[model samples]
Target: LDREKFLNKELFLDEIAREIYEFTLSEFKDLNSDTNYMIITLVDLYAMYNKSMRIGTGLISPMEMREACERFEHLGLNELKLVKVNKRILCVTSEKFDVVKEKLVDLIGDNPGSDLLRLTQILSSNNSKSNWTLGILMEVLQNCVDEGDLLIDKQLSGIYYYKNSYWPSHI
Candidate 1:
């Protein structure tokens, strides 16, 4: 397939894949190295196979994309793929970009525009992974929570709890 023709036919698929990949990478910055590699590999495979299938067969649907991610997870190559794919697919299919944007803006305290690049940067910087940097982020998040500006679910709250729980209690 010619490069231009291939890309043109698979443009929307590529766009969705890219958005999912970026969102997963930014959201799970604290993930272990192995998990991160697995996710990257899964996303790459999705993009590659998706384009190939499109060029070879002519079209790709969101259902196929979800199936691909599920197949990888079923094989255990990327256990996190299911969760990541579920959240991403939901966001894309539901057009809940504004909800994501609202959460990010609430977390970062800045609009940061609507560009994925800038949003990813803000998310990376605020990831609750690093001790020093994440401490600052926690302060900001906690302030928001305390002030009723943000409402986080138990799973999200547990991420911070478990992340910091290993430290000395007195500290």
Candidate 2:
């Protein structure tokens, strides 16, 4: 490796800024057909890029990855967008957050009283992708419950998710 004369950090940073955007764009597009919404966390993407590059995982930091994504939006490609959940996690996806919410709401509406496992099964069945991890389904389901569009039923057997009876009420 050329350790000498590698003093220009900003130069390479700027170079990878565009490179990351291109990578995310293509990656999102590749995932589009396999799922309802093409979604990948920034951490996940970082791991993917570095692992594929056969470099050390620490090459990218959280802030640097975020900067690349922000630059992604700034570049104005509009192929994908950034979403933050609870000001903690960063996710990049093909559709906006609103659409993700809509998908969750509609899913619950169609199959009222479905629990986490059932919901996961429904999503997986529809999408036919193993990427529908339980963790992701749990995040979206819990978020919908928090947002009041979906309700939770605590029963002796299992926790169930239901459509809020009064949602979209026409008064």
Candidate 3:
């Protein structure tokens, strides 16, 4: 049977997501130094499946794809979980979101006027051997923006993030 048919079975889709998690982990686990797991956008995962497929087969809807991930814990896949940041779907390790947020804000506050690309570079450099991607960094930064912990300046050069200075919540 095809991927679609296999996914229709109970627990099957979760199993598939788990396998994908392990495979993706093998490739990207080294990307982050602070964490043992890596994050992949659902969109990227879908694109990967599409690119890997050379023959005819219908693609699964994002919703269906998400459903599979929801069962990750139920299937005993403790290392994998689904995270939603700014309405974006991310498959990531079990790292607490607050800790990630804490690291990001501290970095941004310590290094002002940093853009997506620049922040990603700084993080990677900080990790030395670890290489951070724009996809994951952007999501966290965007989350910070949504939460008013950071502000964005759309300059002629590039979009930069700064610690919110005028926020009402600011002391």
Best by TM-score: 2
- For model 1, the stretches where C-alpha displacement exceeds 4 angstroms are 1-58, 84-171
Superior candidate under TM-score, 1 versus 2:
2
Model 3 residue 12 CA deviation (Å) reads 3.6
- With candidate 2 superimposed using the best TM-score fit, by how many Å does residue 3's alpha carbon deviate from the native? 9.9
TM-score of 3: 0.68
Extract clashing residue pairs from model 1.
none
lDDT, candidate 3, 1-171, per-residue tens: 455566446666666566556655555555436464355666666556545541365556667667767777777777667777556637454466776667677777899988867776777765564434456676777777777888888988989888876675441
Better of 1 and 3 by TM-score: 3
Q: In model 2, which residue pairs have backbone atoms overlapping below 3 Å?
A: none
For candidate 3, what is the lDDT? 0.65
Model 2, 1-171: lDDT tens digits are 322234786655565667666775554444446454556666677777666642642366667677667655666757767778765546777776667767777777888888877777776665564344444566666766666767788998999888777666321
Range of the 10 consecutive residues with the lowest summed lDDT in candidate 1: 86-95
